[PDB]
Design a protein around this ligand. Structure first.
Ligand SMILES: [Ca+2]
Length: 123
């Protein structure tokens, strides 16, 4: 869910306030996501969005009637490293990995402030 994802970003980028810094960036970071990503950070978000669509196709998630946005997987942060819990079931594990990969991606790419709060007409 959102509370764990925001926690993961903070684990990798301890200087960030993710809800302020990563929401509404580019074409993908934020509600929706369409068009060509404007930069590598936006591609991180595009991959993440595609990860959630994929999770929705997993038999495990469908039979659990899961929502990736509300998924209650467990994770831990120590020394700025994220671990997804071994106790997670197949679907929760898939969502945790989507979130983990994105948080790492975010931490490895430049941030172009000119792409924050883009007009969607550029997407
Ligand atoms: Ca999105």
């Amino acid at each position: 869910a959102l509370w764990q994802f925001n926690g993961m970003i903070k684990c990798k980028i301890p200087s960030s306030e993710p809800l302020l810094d990563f929401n509404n960036y580019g074409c993908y970071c934020g509600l929706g996501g369409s068009g060509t990503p404007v930069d590598d950070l936006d591609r991180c978000c595009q991959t993440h969005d595609n990860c959630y669509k994929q999770a929705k196709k997993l038999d495990s998630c469908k039979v659990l009637v899961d929502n990736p946005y509300t998924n209650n997987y467990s994770y831990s942060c120590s020394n700025n490293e994220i671990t997804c819990s071994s106790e997670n079931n197949a679907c929760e594990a898939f969502i945790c990995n989507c979130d983990r990969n994105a948080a790492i991606c975010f931490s490895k790419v430049p941030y172009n402030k000119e792409h924050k709060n883009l007009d969607k007409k550029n997407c």
